[PDB]
């Protein structure tokens, strides 16, 4: 089904087999600079998202669930609603306003999950 | 005790670097057509982000002359400004047998431009027809060293092939940032007590710099940044006279120039589908072009500068003297503003004496005390070597005023020894590398290698 | 602290906030070859260093351990001096003499750390 | 007609103006959308969407 | 300038009209050329003339 093989579906209906999307983010060949800006576009686009995902310790594209509790005021709707009643479009449009904060929280709170789990393990 | 080698990433470590760079100019590089302003294909809208930040106990040697932004700035200025007159008419028809006459104030204290004619190949290549247009007096060479006092030719076409600077391209000095690529970082100092080399005290870092001014001149320094409250002298080796001193002031002295003639354009169609411009029939009475400077403040600024050169020359008296010989391209103050080129001799700024006694002009009896600079003016230009030298600027219509400020001076010492008390101080033909190093010295670009090693007592499973 | 703000302070204070020094490696526009020749810096600098970190088994841009021991001849100072008092600058300037040995040992010793994982994991 | 405006140039016979068709395709990362419904007067939503 | 009883392939001296650094101050010029680098203009009696 390619690039947009599950658009419009609920979250659970497309929370697996994401490989068919992430596996293809590079393309094209020679027309000088005006095209070659689309070849190194992968660095501008793919690697940025990759390092955002990897800085949190969520390297490896699973459903990575790490630290921060979900504050109720952000959506305030039940688990079933967000999980299987909503779709990605308006969910992104509603929550995209707060992701820059969430990534900062995820990366700044990451150091406390690894600061002492190397040498206390040595004692163990 | 037992410990193991442990690896850290994101380590704040750097090395001095050389690298290819960016540019950034503010919103004023985008509104107008293609091929003007000269950053409109290239420069990114700047932001001062990330913000300028202080460092701790950092100690690095900011060598002024061991840098590549000055090299870079020259190669970029030259290589963009050399190709940037390619999309224009490029002459060859006019390299002809002009014919002249007399309109000459036979004994005037004036350096007027000449009227001659020429046979013009009209747009159709086999209907030739005559035409005329004025020409500034240096630009034309007589065809012959004989009694051929009629026959005259342009100074080009024996050396190269030139270009009429298209009017769409303005030469005006728009302020430019240069910037370094991501993964390289730039450093800066805030202190004013710099001397050229050595470890700086109040080190700082910026993503990239402030707004530079690319102007072009030889003796003095116009439009650009400034120091704050003390005069500072920067140079490599005071032992030798062969090298340039660069003089920054705490206050600038106030300069203005004008061309009172009211020039007008006289347009001809030459060659198929392209048009030549020339100075037309000059309206009004002929007057002489010039510059204007305030006598009281320039003398006071001389009085304030002398104490800086007596930091290292207490055994000899300061005196100023004329530019040390040479031709049109080095003896004069030669810069630009307003679409035309002036050539002005600054001997009436550089003779005097400071011998310790500072006697102020205050309270001022004549605030209008000025000393003037008489000028010639050109259209044909050889702006550099290895830049596609030969160019022609079409003349601007009307009359102009270019009030500006002396940001700094470039000077040069004259010799003396064996019971000599009369060393002196003269202009300098600072190259463009000796123009812009006044405005690029603050910054050094460094290369990060954030992979590092440190001790740790980890024993994660084997 | 941005790109270099964490510099100057000691490794005691620079053992954290590592991510801000490595989170940004992209911004700006297009100017042909002459400016595109900075964009491929990511290949020369970022991806190479990440491969360095990977073949040491240290995936994840944070602190990571190794199995290779210390040596007194390299540094010779007390723990507290290096660990809390000095900064990264002179530490890099001094220990860079022996980085070849560290790289070679961490390179070849990984074979001893992945030798027979087929049988050590088969019966679990 | 010219010889007062700008220069002209004769296209060599090899450069024929055969309007030989052209597809398009966005770059990777980006995508193309489309919808088949046939009541779209320049604005408004659509149902039978495709890529 | 040929040595008819010779055996050597010597070059051909010729003269022509050339522009100068004033485009309407023409004067002639001379310089020699290797013979396989010049071809004759016509098969007519006007042979002495030639061209690159
Ligand atoms: C190849 O062909 C060329 C022509 O296409 C030949 O050039 C010609 O050479 C002859 C022989 O030298 C010249 O004719 C002579 O001109 C002199 C003038 O000299 C006098 O005046 C000068 C003034 O400065 C002075 O310096 C001298 O001392 C003399 O006082 C006459 O005096 C001679 O009698 C004779 O007329 C031609 O002028 C010249 N033609 C051109 C167009 O220059 C060339 O020699 C040929 N080369 C070979 C190897 O065959
Ligand atoms: C620069 O020099 C040229 C000549 O070398 C000047 O152009 C010529 O100027 C004369 C004198 O004005 C013109 O002659 C006059 O023509 C009128 C025709 O109505 C006649 O009534 C007068 O008695 C007189 O003969 C002449 O036509 C003109 N040349 C052409 C081709 O028009 C030119 O004016 C000079 N420029 C300056 C600024 O002095
Ligand atoms: C072309 O020439 C004319 C006449 O020379 C210029 O007009 C004159 O310009 C000067 C400034 O250069 C004006 O000076 C006045 O100065 C006083 C300061 O005492 C100030 O308060 C006034 O606001 C004014 O600026 C002068 O009034 C003005 N007119 C005359 C009759 O002199 C003209 O500016 C020149 N063109 C350019 C582009 O400068």
Author numbering:
A (entry chain B), C (entry chain G): 520 to 547, 569 to 664
B (entry chain F): 32 to 139, 150 to 185, 185A, 185B, 186 to 309, 312 to 321, 321C, 322 to 354, ...
D (entry chain A): 194 to 244
E (entry chain K): 134 to 139, 150 to 185, 185A, 185B, 186 to 193
Show the paper's wording:
A glycosylated region near the base of the third variable loop (V3) of HIV-1 Env forms a supersite of vulnerability that is targeted by antibodies originating from diverse germline genes in multiple HIV-1 infected individuals. Here, we determine structures of antibodies in complex with HIV-1 Envelope for all observed members and ancestral states of the broadly neutralizing HIV-1 V3-glycan targeting DH270 antibody clonal B cell lineage. Here we used cryo-EM to visualize the interactions of a complete inferred DH270 clonal tree with the co-evolving virus Env.
Mutations in this I1 subclade were generally further from the antibody-antigen interactive surface with less clear structural impacts.
